[PDB]
Amino acid sequence: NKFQLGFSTLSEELDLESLQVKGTIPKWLSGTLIRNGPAKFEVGKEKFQHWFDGLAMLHKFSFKEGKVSYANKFLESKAYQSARDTDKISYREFATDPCKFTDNANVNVTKIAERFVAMTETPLPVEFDINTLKTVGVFAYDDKIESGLTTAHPHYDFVKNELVNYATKISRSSNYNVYKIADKTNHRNLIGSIPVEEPAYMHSFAMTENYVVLVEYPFVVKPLDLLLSGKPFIENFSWKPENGTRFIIVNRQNGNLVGTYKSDAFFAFHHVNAFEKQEEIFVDIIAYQDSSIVNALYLDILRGQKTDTIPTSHIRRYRIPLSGGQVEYEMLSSEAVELPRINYKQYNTKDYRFVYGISTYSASDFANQLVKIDILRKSSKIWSEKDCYPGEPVFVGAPDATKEDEGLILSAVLDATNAKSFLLILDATTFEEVARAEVPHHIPFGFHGNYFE
Template identity: 55%
Template sequence: MPEQFAQGFTTLKEEIACDSLPVQGSIPTWLEGSLFRTGPAQFEVGQQRYRHWFDGLAMLHSFSFQAGAVSYANKFLQSPAYKAAKETGKISFGEFATDPCRSIFQRVASAFSSESGANANVNISKMGEAFVALTEIPLPVEFDSRTLETVGVIHHDDGVAGQHSTAHPHYDPIRRAGINSITQFGPKSHYNIHTIADGTTQRTLIGSIPVREPAYIHSFGMTENYIVLVEFPLVVNPLSLLTHGKPFIENFQWKPELGTHFHVMRAVDGRVVKSYPGPTFFAFHHINAFERGNDVVVDIVTYPNASIIDNLYLDKVTTNHETALWGAFTRYILPLDGDALIEEAITEEGIELPRINYERNNGREYQFVYSCGGDWANPNDFLNRLVKIDVQAKTAQTWQEDGCYPGEPIFVAAPQAHAEDEGVLLSVVLNSAKGNSFLLVLDATTFRELARAEVPHHIPFSFHGMYSSLREFEGKF
């Protein structure tokens, strides 16, 4: 199986701009805007090789739609990490699981300064009117949405401290502000929850949670009134980040005896109203969270432990990883007037990279989740299907094609949509038989293929992105 999808972890050096991709099927004419993606695209520099999927140098991709046609462009993000690699022929900045040999003095200096490669290969978001690429280092990189040219690293000039943020900020339409969590490592470590109001890059602290051994946190939940931060027992002694000489994630230790802890913070004033001990598990991605009466409901893609991180090292994922690269859809019900949480399995489908109708349902009760998925009976394969889950009926629909490996499905609502699932899904798919990729357009209601647009090269497996309508572009330009 690994030989089928191995190309998804190989370097793409070519940067192109295609005014019109060949389309099979029919793309809805109402789809007018652009899909933006970021992800690792270069896995070696000179004689050095990045060690983990999460480490490769970032490349931006855009698919733009108008009148049923689709264009495509890709361009490397001109981050400090990329520029240094081009200039020196070496890996010059530490990444998630790759670290060039640096002295203890360089390590200490970089841990407490703004030095970073800003290799924003994880997610795309908007900061006010600016389009930004994100990673877990709290330095977004702005790019021009028309040309994909890099504008530059955004430095936050404020008093909110921290060295590691989630790559999944939320947006609060009532406050008109982005919300995120940043971990401050030090003798006194904290999770600092903050906002960034539209029109500014300055962060404002909502609240802070002290922690002795910070956990690795990739995402969090948000309801209409609460922030939900989940601490998994993959934790670090902050001193290790300075003294052990290991790549970032290899300083963390799995301590199952700690269990998992859920913190519910009131968004209006940062007060933690409840903290719940929970069962031991690990997760990258929250699906959604919402309030139901006196309960806070949190939906997460869960793993029994953190071995998923080890299985995504490049020398393992492309040969023979030990366990499945997808998790379980698990619901946790947190009673605000009680002390014990309730755990519930929603579906038997193995899923990862989940998306919902965010604008309509984030922080609210919802019905549908869209995700990549895998076959529990074939754990050595990669994510090879798309899955639509009806959360209320606990049923699932799938799209799958032999030799094809789809990426994160992004939901785009149809104009004047009435139903939650009225729209399309956009997913970048690797076709291992042909050695290239295509953009898949699915009807989100029926889960049937509407169209596909072929790209002349393969696109390495990426993580996340966003869709921006033409209306948003017109508002910006």
């Protein structure tokens, strides 16, 4: 196991004005890339069980006409602050309990009410200063919407300038609460509540021009088990393929229920993109056969010799006939893909051609390449390097771009032989390297980041 180091704690927090650049970073790139992920996998004697459980650390890559500055700090959440001060796991994580719920926002980052927030799947995000990476505190919403579980994968409507998400109220009468947030406010407007007996773990969802599509994988929890059973969060979820996958379509303007459509059981973390065509909706999902991937991302497996027990996922385009009939799918690529990203700003909710992600196909190593899938003419473009393990490829469109794949791809890459990470920058069109920035230490394998102008 050569990628061992990527699942090891990073104690060191620093703020360096310059990183050693090899190449040329386009002048027009003058924004900030914020990477989020786990960077502390134990608290003294107690070890975190799952990859998702590790305490949040933010990594900042700010650009100034060729130069690139770097800073990293642990998110000073109550989860972290309690661990640091008591040397005891204090809050309930995704798959680890101590001996109310966690603010360990280690999944993603966005802006809400023009404030930078780190997110996880618990109700309240954590506000941080993009300048200092200091933690402001818990970001309270100004509304009466109830929730126990939500996503760190909100959508953004650029036309209406709305953040769109859902939150599950987990009670003896549970609801999927689909909501929106207008710019310069922290008030959530309830679009619609879908009642549900046994809520499903939906890490993300699909948004089209008119609709929000909740794809309800049959990986479900009994609310009372979550409340009473003395077992970590994810251990209370059960795979029930008899139920099949339910596509719940909600009009994201008037909150009307368009319809529910069923397919054969499957699981997914990440949606890629969705769009409407004539009397049909197309939902592109990074799908697994079942929920076994969840139990594969425990650290003792990820750190272990047996790599080939981690299930692979593929881009499946599900076609929903609004007219009627069961939902069917086809594969857009034979390549194994995870952590998918697109030209989000321009082509989200719309018909598109290009997907970027990590490739997990195990041709030589596990998670050892970045891939660019061409949906139109099939085929793909690959990036890799000896004993290098790249992170989520973040697309950034070029100024006044006429094409979908005109811009840059930013990826945090772990060099195992060097025992240190570097920020890879690829031309989105050719998918070949233009520059890279050297980081003094290793950046643990994170989840999601975003580029802010």
